């Protein structure tokens, strides 16, 4: 079955790399928890 192992503190890091875009997307959320794009 399933088990947990600690991996770190919940902390902001001053030395953090910045990456990734910031897209603005229209989406719908269905009953199964799935997001889908809308146009």
């Amino acid at each position: 079955d399933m088990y947990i192992e600690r991996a770190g503190d919940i902390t902001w890091e001053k030395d953090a790399e910045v990456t990734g875009n910031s897209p603005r997307l229209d989406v719908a959320l269905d009953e199964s928890g799935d997001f889908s794009l809308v146009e």
Binding site: D1, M2, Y3, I4, E5, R6, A7, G8, D9, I10, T11, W12, E13, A16, E17, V18, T19, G20, N21, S22, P23, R24, L25, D26, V27, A28, L29, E31, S32, G33, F35, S36, L37
Partner: protein, 146 residues
């Protein structure tokens, strides 16, 4: 004990990640499907869960309540399988929905990273990573209700 944790299943594989805060373990529903979790010789049982939000809490109610401020960079505290926890800073995009806007991060990590927390500049968990869409994967910043 407070912190970010790997969710393992048994060879052993990492199926996800979660957050221990205020005595409650928080992860995404699709990671565990609500299964009980071993923590030492103890067992953690689900207390609240919601498939539509894709969230589940163990041992008590959902405790995480901070939200993205809509303007500031955030950090994904990513815990990928087999890799040390690492912080990835990013400016969220936005999922625009009929029920309001949700922050989203355009970061693509292995599936076993699902449940990793997204943090604001004060170190508060503003949501979990791993439920999203493809346009390249974009994750909602999924936050529950306290």
């Amino acid at each position: 004990t407070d912190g970010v944790y790997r969710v393992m299943t048994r060879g052993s594989t990492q199926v996800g990640v979660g957050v221990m805060q205020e005595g409650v373990f928080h992860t995404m529903w699709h990671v565990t499907k609500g299964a009980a979790l071993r923590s030492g010789e103890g067992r953690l049982d689900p207390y609240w869960g919601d498939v539509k939000q894709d969230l589940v809490s163990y041992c008590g109610p959902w405790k995480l309540d901070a939200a993205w401020d809509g303007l500031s960079e955030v950090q994904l505290l990513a815990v990928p399988p087999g890799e040390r926890a690492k912080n990835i800073q990013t400016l969220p995009g936005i999922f625009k929905t009929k029920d309001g806007d949700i922050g989203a991060v355009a970061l693509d990590y292995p599936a076993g990273t699902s449940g990793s927390p997204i943090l604001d500049k004060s170190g508060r968990v503003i949501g979990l990573y791993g439920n999203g869409v493809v346009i390249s994967y974009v994750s909602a910043i999924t936050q529950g209700k306290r």
